[PDB]
Design a protein around this nucleic acid. Sequence first.
DNA 1: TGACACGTGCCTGGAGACTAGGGAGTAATCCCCTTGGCGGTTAAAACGCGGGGGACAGCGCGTACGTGCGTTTAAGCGGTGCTAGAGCTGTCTACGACCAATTGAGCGGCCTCGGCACCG
DNA 2: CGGTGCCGAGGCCGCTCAATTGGTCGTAGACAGCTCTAGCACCGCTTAAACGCACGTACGCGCTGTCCCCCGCGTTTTAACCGCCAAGGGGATTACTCCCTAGTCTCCAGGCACGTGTCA
Lengths: 94, 77, 97, 90, 81, 80, 92, 93
Amino acid sequence: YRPGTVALREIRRYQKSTELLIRKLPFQRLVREIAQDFKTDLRFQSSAVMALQEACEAYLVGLFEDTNLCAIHAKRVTIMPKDIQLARRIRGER
Amino acid sequence: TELLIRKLPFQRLVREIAQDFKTDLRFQSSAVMALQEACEAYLVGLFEDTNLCAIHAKRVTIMPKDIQLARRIRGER
Amino acid sequence: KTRSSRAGLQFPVGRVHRLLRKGNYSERVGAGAPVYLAAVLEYLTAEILELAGNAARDNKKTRIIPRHLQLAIRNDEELNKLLGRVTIAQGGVLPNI
Amino acid sequence: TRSSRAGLQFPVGRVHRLLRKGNYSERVGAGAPVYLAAVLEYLTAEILELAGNAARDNKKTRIIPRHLQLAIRNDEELNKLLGRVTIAQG
Amino acid sequence: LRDNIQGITKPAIRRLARRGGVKRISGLIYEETRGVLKVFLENVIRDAVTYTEHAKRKTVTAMDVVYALKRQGRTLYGFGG
Amino acid sequence: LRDNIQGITKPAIRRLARRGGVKRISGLIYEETRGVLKVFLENVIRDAVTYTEHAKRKTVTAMDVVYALKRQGRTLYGFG
Amino acid sequence: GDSFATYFRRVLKQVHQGLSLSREAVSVMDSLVHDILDRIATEAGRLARSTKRQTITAWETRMAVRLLLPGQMGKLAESEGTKAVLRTSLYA
Amino acid sequence: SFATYFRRVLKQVHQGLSLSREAVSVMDSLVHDILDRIATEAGRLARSTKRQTITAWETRMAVRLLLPGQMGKLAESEGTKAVLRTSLYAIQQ
DNA sequence: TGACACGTGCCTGGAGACTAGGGAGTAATCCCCTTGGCGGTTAAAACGCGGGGGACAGCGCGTACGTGCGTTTAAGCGGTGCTAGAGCTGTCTACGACCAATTGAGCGGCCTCGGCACCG
DNA sequence: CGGTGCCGAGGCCGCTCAATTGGTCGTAGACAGCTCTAGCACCGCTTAAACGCACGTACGCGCTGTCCCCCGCGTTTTAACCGCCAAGGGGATTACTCCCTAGTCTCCAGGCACGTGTCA
């Protein structure tokens, strides 16, 4: 009820499960619009779009756990863009 | 640009670790020099990352938590 | 007969030899390389299966799914070190806060 | 020589031989160790120009591995291409 | 298709980060993570499309995507290889 | 050889840190960085000695060390 | 096809006879076995090419496994491989 | 390897300079590493397509994968120029 | 004083011309899967409002760290010598590629059945 | 925790194709011998680097107040989505061949090393 005790429950119920978290159709439209500026009039296998979604979801989850590490290290619980930027800079992706 | 770790202590260190691994081993000077250069580069990179971590936490000193966080984010543990 | 029965391996020695030759990792492949490779692959796969089965029994499910494989891979330190840059499909993450 | 017909200072030969001895595939086409040689020639002409610029900036003329490291690390594309590289005595 | 990075809705990012481990998310996280996701998707799709262009194809296959992901050091297992 | 990790002395670690770009150093950094360096040496040396053992050679050469570095992910230029 | 589904089922029955795999699990574990095979093969080939050897024999694969699998798991896998090679050589 | 092949390039770019022994021993290793990377990518691509050869197409796509658009386009243009020049020379014999 | 440019000489791999065979280029052909559309329905996202908690900045304490100086030490230097063993050649034989004949192990089709999900 | 339904995993038979088996051989690598690089151990001097305190203060850390900005929750919109269908574009196969790359005989000429003049 009070701020908290619901985010932790959400973490408990969402780390246990494995279902996809990004809506399928918006991600399909996103990958189509990104790929349409490299090669024009392309076609995507359904398994290919699904693999892209399952890779991007895992990468974003890893980046968010690293940015939570950064936020906790700074004596904060709220993640801010500086945390994400530092995590991506240390990871070497930049 | 010059070598920071002293040559003889590093040579003795690497010999100790090698003889821990495989006994009665020999090291040609090029191998020891290459190891020293690699370790210098790795440590300066690690200290770059830990300085970034320290600056992130509103600090100018680096503390062991900063090194641990840098290593954990980099992946190696 | 065969070479899996000769070495007492569940894994196929001939198939892994064929994979070695097809992948073109070297011009010639020795006779002991496929047997050794089948042995190490069988041991590693047996370890992964045992860990995943333990996880499934802990989860109280008799069917192994990729979530249990991810749990088995990321619960043991050696497997996690060997497969840390890998995202198992429909694998999820182990619960930690 | 094929370097004569091509506009390549980098050798079209000694790259076909390197490809064949490296066993990167069963066979190597004719144009492969010409495209590859041209790409390497460009990837050397750049890097060499940058190191020369760095040496002129430091007024040292001679190219030292420090200049090569500066050239590699001072450009975003070359930095991305060679990011896990440590140059000896650099 | 105009813009679709808004297709990664704010609750979607919130649930993603919540599974990641966070418990409070600042308002400015959404734009930054959308940019990060777009950058990563462009990087992967460029390789997965060069693979198809090499194969003289017109349909991006799951094998192309998994090869592109492997080239970046982020291996994917559940979709063949 | 006993207690040769002390060969990476405190001023050497401090100078490495200064080259890294830091401005201040905490006292407990030295033990942590000695442990980090020992771990890195153990990994690279294990790879190098396996390389020499495969070649049935009793002397570790620069080629084996650079191969170990390239395998670990930090390629080295200038030795082979 | 080229897949180790039956071998995974057989080894599971050997280890955990009460259980059963699923098609998604079979696919991911087949990909994992293929990837580990490719890694070990590439390392052994690189080792063979390092010493001017154009063959990949038991020594090269053994060193590739030892150099790719540090820790106790590497020692156990090496012992298992040596046992398998010795058992094969016993057919004489 | 590639000893004078760097001095030749340095003769036409930034004249009046020279390459030291350490610089040469770094650059030949760098060229070998880049060549090995491109060749391995070309081999992997050819194997993926189920072809056992490395031709101009394979290396084109390999350098497109390695060098991204800001520079890979320039290297692709240079390689295409070289290939077409060789082909035009071979046309007339 | 060491290194680069210009003769001078040696040297072995690139190259020209030819042969041979097979890799894959190319043209049809089939039909699987992808795209586009319709439509209810309904779970989820968007929006707004109240509120609590926590990010941030200021302030004070006390502690631990960089700097300087005197003392200790062992690294680096330059020979000097001893000899492991790296590298090379010579050679010879064991073995893996290759091919022809054989066969049984695993894959697919089809019938059974209990685990997983849903609700009460 | 119990009752009901769904379907993917399991087990038996057909078989076929990939794994076995046997013989050949010509070379890659095992093995012996030998030379000479250079790795290791030691001698002493010197001096640059480390080492040990004293210390004054920069700064990490704790405390406190705020104000604002995310969280929870209710409601409405809205777009996912699931079911179904039409259409055809391009994945995937297959037969012919023809042109390209493996392989082999020269042949030398660019490449490499060296001596010498000259400048960094």
